[PDB]
Amino acid sequence: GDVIAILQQALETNSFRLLFQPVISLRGDSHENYEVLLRLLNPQGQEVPPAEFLHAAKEAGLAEKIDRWVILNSIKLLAEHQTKLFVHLSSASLQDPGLLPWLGVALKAARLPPESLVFQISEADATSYLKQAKQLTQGLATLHCQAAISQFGCSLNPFNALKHLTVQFIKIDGSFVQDLNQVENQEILKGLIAELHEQQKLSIVPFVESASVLATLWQAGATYIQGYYLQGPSQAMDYDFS
Numbered sequence: 001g002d003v004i005a006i007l008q009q010a011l012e013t014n015s016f017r018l019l020f021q022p023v024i025s026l027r028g029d030s031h032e033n034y035e036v037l038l039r040l041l042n043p044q045g046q047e048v049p050p051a052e053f054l055h056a057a058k059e060a061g062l063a064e065k066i067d068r069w070v071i072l073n074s075i076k077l078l079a080e081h082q083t084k085l086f087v088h089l090s091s092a093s094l095q096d097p098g099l100l101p102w103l104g105v106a107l108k109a110a111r112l113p114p115e116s117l118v119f120q121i122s123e124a125d126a127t128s129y130l131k132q133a134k135q136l137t138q139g140l141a142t143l144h145c146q147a148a149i150s151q152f153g154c155s156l157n158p159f160n161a162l163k164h165l166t167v168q169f170i171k172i173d174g175s176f177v178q179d180l181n182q183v184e185n186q187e188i189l190k191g192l193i194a195e196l197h198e199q200q201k202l203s204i205v206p207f208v209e210s211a212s213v214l215a216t217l218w219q220a221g222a223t224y225i226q227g228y229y230l231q232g233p234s235q236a237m238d239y240d241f242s
């Protein structure tokens with residue numbers, strides 16, 4: 001239609017919804033972690049997935065505003081439990097010199113505890129905008145936020161990026177848990193996890209949709225898992241982590 005007109009209006013009328021998908025600790029950590037996922041609410045009140053609007057938003061100069069809406073609301077809902085939220089950043093926000101100054105004031109205004117937010121950057125974006133990702137993640141550390149790289153492991157030399165960035169969590173690409181009946185894929189997954197741990201990064205493995213995969217990941221040493229098998233995205237944070 002005019003997705004752009006709809007987005008412009010949505011940003012001014014709270015016509016978005018946050019969903020939450022729990023991230024589960026396998027090694028005894030007590031935080032109640034959730035990933036925040038965004039849905040646009042169309043004029044009929046239906047949830048529309050990021051695939052249908054984030055691209056057009058960025059091209060129309062709206063991506064930073066969408067990220068600020070998500071972050072502002074995450075900070076709020078959080079404030080309302082040892083909860084930690086994983087929040088996505090678009091590439092536009094990576095490049096935005098105003099993000100850090102604004103985030104600093106936004107955190108203080110809600111009186112948010114340290115280590116409450118983890119900002120997620122895709123591997124592709126971390127690599128494409130390496131200098132900006134370096135600066136942003138260093139700044140996040142100064143503000144006592146954490147950071148993560150998601151969709152990890154698909155670039156030619158995925159570990160090189162970590163030489164430059166300040167990140168505590170690494171969320172590997174969902175492709176790595178497909179076809180785990182093949183021993184080659186088991187070995188690839190195990191090696192990836194092992195190398196992340198050598199680098200003292202916490203591994204998160206998503207797309208867990210089966211007991212065999214859950215068990216394989218647990219034996220491979222993954223520090224956290226996520227997937228429909230545990231719980232899909234929901235409007236409420238009521239997962240039983242205990």
Ligand SMILES: Nc1nc2c(ncn2[C@@H]2O[C@@H]3COP(=O)(O)O[C@H]4[C@@H](O)[C@H](n5cnc6c(=O)[nH]c(N)nc65)O[C@@H]4COP(=O)(O)O[C@H]3[C@H]2O)c(=O)[nH]1
Nearest residue numbers: 036037038049050070088089090150207208209227228233
């Ligand atoms: N097959 C399968 N799928 C699963 C499973 N568990 C979760 N998913 C879905 O897999 C996608 C994971 O997010 P992402 O791909 O890393 O990447 C995200 C991220 O790049 C972007 N995104 C979503 N929310 C936000 C947001 O708040 N801000 C920004 N900047 N980007 C967002 O949109 C992408 C897609 O998000 P979603 O449509 O919510 O789609 C999500 C999630 O709903 C599973 O076990 N199996």
